[PDB]
Design an enzyme around this catalytic site. Structure first.
Site, short mmCIF file in Angstrom:
data_model
loop_
_atom_site.label_atom_id
_atom_site.label_comp_id
_atom_site.label_asym_id
_atom_site.label_seq_id
_atom_site.Cartn_x
_atom_site.Cartn_y
_atom_site.Cartn_z
N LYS A 184 11.73 -6.45 -11.81
CA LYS A 184 10.82 -7.62 -11.03
C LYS A 184 11.40 -7.12 -9.92
CE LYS A 184 12.89 -11.16 -14.39
NZ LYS A 184 14.09 -12.80 -14.32
N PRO A 224 10.54 -8.54 -6.10
CA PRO A 224 10.71 -9.71 -4.87
C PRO A 224 9.48 -9.31 -4.27
CG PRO A 224 12.19 -8.32 -4.26
CD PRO A 224 11.85 -7.83 -5.24
N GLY A 247 7.80 -8.99 0.96
CA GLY A 247 9.10 -7.51 1.29
C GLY A 247 8.34 -7.35 2.64
N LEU A 248 9.03 -6.29 3.54
CA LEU A 248 9.26 -6.22 4.73
C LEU A 248 7.99 -4.81 4.35
CD1 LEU A 248 9.95 -6.49 8.02
CD2 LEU A 248 11.72 -4.95 6.90
N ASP A 288 8.88 -2.22 1.97
CA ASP A 288 7.82 -0.94 1.53
C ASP A 288 7.84 0.29 2.83
OD1 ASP A 288 4.73 -0.82 0.52
OD2 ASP A 288 4.49 -0.68 2.44
N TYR A 336 4.52 7.42 7.68
CA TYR A 336 4.69 6.51 8.59
C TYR A 336 5.95 6.99 9.87
CZ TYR A 336 3.04 2.44 5.60
OH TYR A 336 2.49 2.09 4.80
N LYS A 349 5.29 5.68 -0.75
CA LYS A 349 4.24 6.03 -1.46
C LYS A 349 4.43 8.16 -0.91
CE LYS A 349 2.40 2.06 0.49
NZ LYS A 349 3.54 1.97 2.26
N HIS A 373 -0.86 7.55 -2.70
CA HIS A 373 -0.95 6.00 -1.15
C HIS A 373 -2.56 6.30 -1.04
CE1 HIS A 373 0.52 5.53 3.10
NE2 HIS A 373 -0.32 4.60 3.05
N1 LIG Z 1 -1.31 0.78 1.27
C1 LIG Z 1 -1.27 1.09 2.95
O1 LIG Z 1 -2.03 2.32 2.78
C2 LIG Z 1 -1.40 0.53 3.57
C3 LIG Z 1 -2.07 0.12 5.02
C4 LIG Z 1 -1.59 -0.66 6.11
C5 LIG Z 1 -0.43 -1.49 5.63
N2 LIG Z 1 0.27 -1.15 4.51
C6 LIG Z 1 1.90 -1.94 4.39
O2 LIG Z 1 1.85 -3.20 4.85
C7 LIG Z 1 2.73 -3.60 5.75
C8 LIG Z 1 1.71 -5.07 6.76
O3 LIG Z 1 0.29 -4.80 7.29
P1 LIG Z 1 0.04 -3.84 8.90
O4 LIG Z 1 1.49 -3.66 9.04
O5 LIG Z 1 -0.82 -3.42 8.89
O6 LIG Z 1 0.18 -5.48 9.95
P2 LIG Z 1 0.67 -6.99 9.48
O7 LIG Z 1 2.11 -7.04 8.69
O8 LIG Z 1 -0.51 -7.82 9.50
O9 LIG Z 1 1.13 -7.53 11.42
C9 LIG Z 1 2.09 -6.81 11.59
C10 LIG Z 1 2.11 -7.37 13.02
O10 LIG Z 1 2.37 -8.14 13.54
C11 LIG Z 1 3.04 -8.91 14.07
N3 LIG Z 1 3.57 -10.11 13.16
C12 LIG Z 1 4.32 -9.99 12.71
N4 LIG Z 1 5.16 -10.94 12.41
C13 LIG Z 1 4.48 -12.48 13.19
C14 LIG Z 1 4.31 -13.57 13.39
N5 LIG Z 1 5.10 -14.62 12.32
N6 LIG Z 1 3.65 -13.65 14.55
C15 LIG Z 1 2.60 -13.74 15.16
N7 LIG Z 1 3.11 -11.77 15.12
C16 LIG Z 1 3.67 -11.34 14.01
C17 LIG Z 1 3.63 -7.62 14.12
O11 LIG Z 1 5.02 -7.70 15.23
P3 LIG Z 1 5.60 -7.20 16.22
O12 LIG Z 1 6.61 -5.91 14.74
O13 LIG Z 1 5.83 -6.07 17.29
O14 LIG Z 1 6.84 -8.03 15.57
C18 LIG Z 1 2.91 -5.91 14.63
O15 LIG Z 1 2.32 -6.64 15.40
C19 LIG Z 1 2.37 -2.09 6.70
O16 LIG Z 1 3.45 -2.19 7.55
C20 LIG Z 1 2.95 -1.43 5.01
O17 LIG Z 1 4.15 -0.96 5.08
C21 LIG Z 1 0.57 -0.30 3.27
O1 LIG Z 2 -1.15 4.85 6.22
C1 LIG Z 2 -1.05 3.16 6.22
O2 LIG Z 2 -0.68 2.78 5.26
C2 LIG Z 2 -1.91 2.53 6.95
C3 LIG Z 2 -2.37 3.41 7.59
C4 LIG Z 2 -4.03 4.19 6.99
C5 LIG Z 2 -5.29 3.69 7.69
C6 LIG Z 2 -6.05 4.61 7.14
C7 LIG Z 2 -5.62 5.64 6.16
C8 LIG Z 2 -6.68 6.62 5.51
C9 LIG Z 2 -5.70 6.92 4.37
C10 LIG Z 2 -6.48 8.25 3.74
C11 LIG Z 2 -7.43 8.15 3.39
C12 LIG Z 2 -8.79 7.02 4.16
N1 LIG Z 2 -9.92 6.78 3.71
O3 LIG Z 2 -9.95 7.13 2.74
O4 LIG Z 2 -10.38 6.00 4.31
C13 LIG Z 2 -7.63 6.06 4.58
S1 LIG Z 2 -4.35 5.96 6.29
#
Ligand SMILES: NC(=O)c1ccc[n+]([C@@H]2O[C@H](COP(=O)([O-])OP(=O)(O)OC[C@H]3O[C@@H](n4cnc5c(N)ncnc54)[C@H](OP(=O)(O)O)[C@@H]3O)[C@@H](O)[C@H]2O)c1
Ligand SMILES: O=C(O)CCc1ccc(-c2cccc([N+](=O)[O-])c2)s1
EC number: 1.1.1.21
Length: 316
Positions: free
Chosen positions: A12, A14, A17-18, A44, A49, A78, A111
């Site tokens: 399971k 959650p 997540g953060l 996460d 990062y 990732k 990733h």
């Molecule tokens: N797999 C991937 O390729 C991938 C790509 C992008 C993201 N991710 C994951 O997803 C997570 C979330 O995405 P994200 O970091 O791009 O952006 P997000 O969670 O959409 O937004 C983060 C931003 O929003 C602000 N924020 C947070 N809570 C708020 C609230 N209650 N009111 C107003 N502003 C608020 C934060 O500021 P403060 O921190 O200053 O409070 C920060 O500037 C990432 O951290 C990462 O773990 C994964």
């Molecule tokens: O790293 C994170 O989770 C957020 C930060 C990124 C933003 C764009 C990323 C990226 C990496 C590889 C390929 C491609 N692509 O094919 O467009 C994009 S990493």
């Protein structure tokens, strides 16, 4: 709204997540400590990062303090692109485990579907700025991920930023041993992802929504970009429910049977973002939020658009 969703590995996960992308290393330890204190049980993470050690300090303290048991936490990381070679996957996972101070991950994701040349640089470039690909087939990377399950290093494996055809390629892999448990993709009212989500869900793959707030701290933000947090249509829905706009943006994917991972290092926002299990959006609210789709992406890089496995040429 139950707090966890059942994965196809029997565990399971959650639904809240953060996130930790962009969380400064000198703030993320306290952020994760606060998060765990106020109820978060899913973090996460990613090697790319550059803050996994500091995330790990927080997790370890809370385990040591007996605030939470390891079995109650769901820790995700990732595999970065430069580690797609089969011989590099275990070491990459183990480095993440060492930094996070864990003996297993609950979920380990590829990733991106794009493999890059291995080396110190996370984005190896040629002299014109194109990323230098690796020739390792993603199906081979998947087999290397499966080995991690069989070695006890991870409880579940999955994918991230895979398009529908790429998910299908994995599902159709000759000799597939473990299906992906999760596909983690960008998802919010400006990028609603109906087709990809329904496909994944139909195959028993849980979808995690990233950048649910529209990533206002993304490095490449421009003034002319749309802004979810400032959209008066979304603010209106929030006001009606006596919640913040962020709370609506977090509740939205929850009601689509998605996992969601908002990022914050601000203690008050970390707490705010968790207080989303005490209200419901109506079907009308949901359909209204879905109507805001415009296929707008926070995450898509010019340097990768010629990579053979670039995921965002395809409709979905
Ligand atoms: N797999 C991937 O390729 C991938 C790509 C992008 C993201 N991710 C994951 O997803 C997570 C979330 O995405 P994200 O970091 O791009 O952006 P997000 O969670 O959409 O937004 C983060 C931003 O929003 C602000 N924020 C947070 N809570 C708020 C609230 N209650 N009111 C107003 N502003 C608020 C934060 O500021 P403060 O921190 O200053 O409070 C920060 O500037 C990432 O951290 C990462 O773990 C994964
Ligand atoms: O790293 C994170 O989770 C957020 C930060 C990124 C933003 C764009 C990323 C990226 C990496 C590889 C390929 C491609 N692509 O094919 O467009 C994009 S990493």
């Amino acid at each position: 709204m139950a707090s966890r969703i059942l994965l196809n590995n029997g565990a399971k996960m959650p639904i809240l997540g953060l996130g930790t992308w962009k969380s400064p290393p000198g703030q993320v330890t306290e952020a994760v400590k606060v998060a765990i204190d106020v109820g978060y049980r899913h973090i996460d993470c990613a090697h790319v990062y550059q803050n996994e050690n500091e995330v790990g300090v927080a997790i370890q303290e809370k385990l040591r303090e007996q605030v939470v048991k390891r079995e109650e936490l769901f820790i995700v990381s990732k595999l970065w692109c430069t580690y797609h070679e089969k011989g590099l996957v275990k070491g990459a996972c183990q480095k993440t485990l060492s930094d996070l101070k864990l003996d297993y991950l609950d979920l380990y994701l590829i990733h991106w579907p794009t493999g890059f040349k291995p080396g110190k640089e996370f984005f190896p470039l040629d002299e014109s700025g194109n990323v230098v690909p690796s020739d390792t087939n993603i199906l081979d990377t998947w087999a290397a991920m499966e080995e991690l399950v069989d070695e006890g290093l991870v409880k579940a494996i999955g994918i991230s930023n895979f398009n529908h055809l790429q998910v299908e390629m994995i599902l159709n892999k000759p000799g597939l041993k473990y299906k992906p448990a999760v596909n983690q993709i960008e998802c919010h009212p400006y990028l609603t992802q109906e087709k990809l989500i329904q496909y994944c869900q139909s195959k028993g793959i849980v979808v995690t929504a990233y950048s649910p707030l529209g990533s206002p701290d993304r490095p490449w933000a421009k003034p002319e970009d749309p802004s979810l947090l400032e959209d008066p249509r979304i603010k209106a829905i929030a006001a009606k429910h006596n919640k913040t706009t962020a709370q609506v943006l977090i509740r939205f994917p929850m009601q689509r049977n998605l996992v969601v991972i908002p990022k914050s290092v601000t203690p008050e926002r970390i707490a705010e973002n968790f207080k989303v299990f005490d209200f419901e959006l109506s079907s009308q609210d949901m359909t209204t939020l879905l109507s805001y789709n415009r296929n707008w992406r926070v995450c898509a890089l010019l340097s990768c658009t010629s990579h053979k496995d670039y995921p965002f040429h395809e409709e979905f």
